Every structure is written in structure tokens, then in C-alpha cells.
Design an enzyme around this catalytic site. Structure first.
Site, PDB file in Angstrom:
ATOM      1  N   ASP A 180     -13.360  30.252  -0.077  1.00  0.00           N
ATOM      2  CA  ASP A 180     -13.580  31.370  -1.174  1.00  0.00           C
ATOM      3  C   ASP A 180     -14.492  32.923  -0.174  1.00  0.00           C
ATOM      4  OD1 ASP A 180     -12.583  31.283  -4.281  1.00  0.00           O
ATOM      5  OD2 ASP A 180     -14.457  32.450  -4.012  1.00  0.00           O
TER       6      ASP A 180
ATOM      7  N   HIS B 122      -8.088  24.616  -4.521  1.00  0.00           N
ATOM      8  CA  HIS B 122      -7.988  25.348  -4.475  1.00  0.00           C
ATOM      9  C   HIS B 122      -9.494  24.956  -3.850  1.00  0.00           C
ATOM     10  CE1 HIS B 122     -10.112  29.375  -3.489  1.00  0.00           C
ATOM     11  NE2 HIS B 122     -10.707  28.886  -4.213  1.00  0.00           N
TER      12      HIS B 122
END
Ligand code: CA
Lengths: 297, 298
Positions: free
Chosen positions: B108, B278
Site C-alpha cells: 500500500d 488488499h
């Protein structure tokens, strides 16, 4: 809450989807004025009297907005799609005996308006849309610069209760931020403070805020889909229409508005007004004069 | 109240010119820096860092301004939260440890620090792993209706202060759990260790931490984009061997392959999907760990 339409009547129009609140004034051909987000009908308070010289002005709160009833939404945000809203407003106008009327909309109400004109053009003599492009066009142009400028299109469309939970911490700030940020001046100075009080109070209701999100969720899904079908079928608005937009407004940021609308409307004239997004309050005289002229034709 | 999720790791406060970087450090062997992203802290690595500590000196750092790292004061261009500036700060932090050539894995936001570090200072990296991202330039170039809805927070958190700050304050607990839950494959918090969630929740509870995260996203919309743009236009590619891992249910994936996108940015990139949302290191810790140790040993 102040009365900003002195001399206008007040009607509660019942429809199958709930009551529409409307200030009613003037005489002559029927003219329906539709506000947008995050406002109520009172945003027309500076131009409606001038229109009321020449028209029966009907200043309605959108379904779910202001004092109108809030139809319970569903998984597809159906009552807050512009298609459903247009249907409900057609119904409301029929209760008043108006089956053929002129229509001016701003922001969300402008989206109801062109969708009404696509779905039921026989209901409209003339149509004015204030500072919008079709929903399809916003999404199709949603690049980086545009995603930043109208972030609220994707933010408020997030699944419940994410926007609602964030808006509920300080609703006053958000309604005021959205009003300020899209004026030419960047502040609340274009607005009558009694009007801001209407906007602020409407926004303070958690149900009203939910409805606004539902409207934005419809705007991201069904409204987009409805528009997509029309633009990909080449369905154009056949009603004479005026597209007015602010030189500093939303519509002009990612396109030349009259070029876009000529793709959508067979008979469209356009004029910019020196203004932010909120044409009827930022530039009331220039807006009312554009509308009087167009609707008198 | 805050669980120690790295048994056997020490704790370092690493001084840099821009403030302290907090890190858990464990293991021995070649130095491996692990960089978390949003809205997490270094503890997101707690399930794979022990695995990696088998073969590496694992340095699990809070990004500048995140977790317990210091928050350098931002400016009008959000400079300390640009990936370039964060990368420079972490390069300096690693230098304080005597690590001038290291392996790097980021997830991320930390993966954005990581490829920007690889672009700016490729000599610092033995190998680079990026988890579940595409370059910032690519997200913005692919900005369309669908992506705008899915990564709405890229434009929401980049709004000028104090707009996102004020809204985030409306319900920060809900926001961080929502972001965590919504990007998992399950759609809830069941993939996360509850002690990790409390770390993320408590970091997110500080308004100044939330402000820094918005600064990070403001950088992500502006300077970070412009820095990526220059490299795209100059044909600069990442020359370090690179591993791109993405979740089958993740942000990076869409219709085109993340690996095909990363080949435009890196000369030597391998890539694997991981059955995951994610948060690869928490949703798929073993599969992530295995892919990382196999890549980083080479
Ligand atoms: Ca709440």
C-alpha cells in the site's frame, strides 16, 4: 426558518411516492424549478419572484429533500434515481393540473430535469439546466483532475453507512463547505444567510443526509446506466433547452458545456454566466434574465 | 493494552533529519525493510515478519508520520509525505543502522515509498517487493468511473484540509474498520488479528495521525503523481529485481494484469496473484511469506 418567497403559496402535493413540498406563486404558464445539492427549494428565492411576474412558478423540494417526503430507498436507490424523481414530479405536477410545463433545474434538479426530458418529453414545453452536464458525461470524463474537483461524486456514492457516518460527526461543516467551495468567491457571501439556515437545517437531519447519499448512489449507478443507454442509442432531448453554466462552476471544469449538450439535445442554446456553481444565488439577475428570455420564447 | 505482536523483535527509534522512525527489528542476515501502508502500522507484518526473520534482519518500520514514527511538519506541497521525501528519510534511517544496501518490501503506501525509492536511489536496493499496488501515476491515469468509486479515498483524502480531517473525525473508529474490512476478500474484520486492529484503531484515533495520512494522499494526488510522470516520460525503469504481489480480490487488479503494468516500470519484475483482498500479509500470511522469502533469497 424564514419565508424567502413572500406572497408565494405553499403546497403539499401528494404523490404515490410521498408528498412534494412546493412554494407556488405568480400566474401564467407553469414553470417548475428544481434545486439540487445540498440545497432546498429556497435557493430560487432570488430569481423566483422575477419569474413569477410571467409564469406560475412552482418551486419544489426534490423527492427526499427539504420538506418533501423521503421515499424509503432500496438496493438500487430507485426512488432517488432521476428517473423515479422525474416520475414523481410529473405526478406532482398532474395533481396541480400541469401536464405540460416548463422546467428549470439546478444541480440534482437539473439531472431530474434532463432525465424527465428524455423519459417523458411531451411533459415539457421548454427545459433549462443550470450548471450541469449529463451524469454520464461527468463519469466519462472522470480523470484525475476531475476526480479531485468533484470527489463528492464518488465519496457520497460509497455504500451506506460510510458517507452517512462521516457526515454525522459535523453536518454543519460539510453543508457549509460544499456551499462555500463552489461559489465564485469561495465563501458563503453569495448566499442569503436565511437561505443558508434552510440548507443547514435540512442537512442536520440524518435521514435527509442519507437521502442525499442515495441520490449520489443513484447518480453513480442507475442514473449513469440510464444515461448510458440514451447516449449509446443516440436518444437526444427533443425539447428546446437552455444550458446555463457558471464560468467558475462545475460543468465547465471538464468540458465545454454547449458542445456536450449538443450531443444530448437536438435544440439547445447555452450561455455562461459569471458565477460559481450556484447561479440563481450568485448571479440572480443574470440568471433570472436568461430564464425569462428563454421561457418567453 | 497494545499487544506485542513481534515476539523476539526488539524496538528501535531510528533518528533521521526529519524525525524518528519507529521499527521492530528481529532476525539476522541480510537487511530487509518492511513498509506498511494505509491505514495500518508496522504491525500488519506481524504474521509474516517472524517467517522472514528466519533468514533476514527484518526491520519493520512505521512510515514517517505513521504509527509511532515522528510526524515531520508538512508544508504547502506536503513535501515530507511525498514518497520521494519518505524514501529519503527511510534511506537515512537505514543508514543509521549501517544498511546502505537492503531488500525492501512494501504494501500500500509503503509500496509507493518503495518503488519511488527504487526509482530515485536504485543502488540502495538489492531486491524490491511491492504488495498490491500499481504506481501512483497508473492509478490516476486509469481514473475512470469504476476506479473512482473503488478507490474514492484517493480523491477524498486528497481534498484540501481540513475537509477530510473533519469528516474523518466524524467517526474514526468506523472509518478505519470500514477501510480494513472493505478491502479484504471476506468483507469483514475476520482476517485480522484483533490485537492488530486495535493498533490500527488507536493510531487512527489521533487527529494528527489522520492529518498526516491525508497529507500522504494529498502528496499522492500531486507531487507523487508529478514525480511518477517525469519517470514515465523519461523512460526511467526500476532496475532492481522486483516482485509484484497482488490480491486476486485486491486494489491493484482490475481487468489488465498488474504484472503487465509493472513491466512498463521495471526491467526485471516477477509477479504472482495471491488469493487475498488488499491486505496480503494478514489475509494470506503463509502464501505471502513464502513468496517473499523465495524471492528475497534468489
Ligand atoms: Ca457513528
Amino acid at each position: 426558518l424564514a419565508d424567502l418567497f413572500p406572497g408565494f403559496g405553499s403546497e403539499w402535493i401528494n404523490t404515490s411516492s410521498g408528498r412534494i413540498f412546493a412554494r407556488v406563486g405568480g400566474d401564467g404558464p407553469p414553470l417548475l424549478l428544481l434545486h439540487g445539492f445540498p440545497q432546498t427549494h429556497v435557493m430560487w428565492h432570488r430569481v423566483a419572484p422575477k419569474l413569477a411576474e410571467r409564469f406560475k412558478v412552482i418551486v419544489a423540494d426534490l423527492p427526499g429533500y427539504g420538506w418533501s417526503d423521503m421515499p424509503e430507498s432500496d438496493e438500487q436507490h430507485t426512488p432517488y434515481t432521476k428517473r423515479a424523481m422525474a416520475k414523481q414530479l410529473i405526478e406532482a405536477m398532474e395533481q396541480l393540473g400541469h401536464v405540460h410545463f416548463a422546467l428549470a433545474g439546478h444541480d440534482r434538479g437539473a439531472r431530474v430535469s434532463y432525465r424527465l426530458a428524455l423519459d417523458s418529453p411531451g411533459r415539457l414545453s421548454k427545459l433549462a439546466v443550470l450548471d450541469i452536464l449529463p451524469t454520464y458525461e461527468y463519469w466519462q470524463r472522470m480523470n484525475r483532475a476531475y476526480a479531485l474537483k468533484i470527489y463528492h461524486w464518488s465519496f457520497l456514492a460509497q455504500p451506506a453507512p460510510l458517507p452517512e457516518n462521516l457526515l454525522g460527526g459535523d453536518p454543519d461543516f460539510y453543508v457549509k463547505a460544499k456551499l462555500a467551495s463552489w461559489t465564485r468567491a469561495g465563501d458563503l457571501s453569495a448566499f442569503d444567510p436565511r437561505a443558508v439556515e434552510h440548507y443547514r437545517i435540512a442537512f442536520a437531519d440524518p435521514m435527509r443526509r442519507h437521502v442525499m447519499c442515495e441520490d449520489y448512489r443513484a447518480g453513480a449507478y442507475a442514473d449513469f446506466e440510464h444515461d448510458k443507454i440514451d447516449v449509446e442509442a443516440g436518444n437526444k432531448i427533443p425539447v428546446p433547452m437552455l444550458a446555463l453554466w457558471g464560468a467558475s462552476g462545475i460543468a465547465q471544469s471538464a468540458a465545454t458545456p454547449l458542445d456536450v449538450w449538443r450531443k444530448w439535445a437536438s435544440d439547445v442554446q447555452g450561455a455562461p454566466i459569471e458565477s460559481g456553481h450556484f447561479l440563481p444565488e450568485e448571479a440572480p439577475d443574470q440568471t433570472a434574465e436568461a430564464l425569462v428570455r428563454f421561457f418567453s420564447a
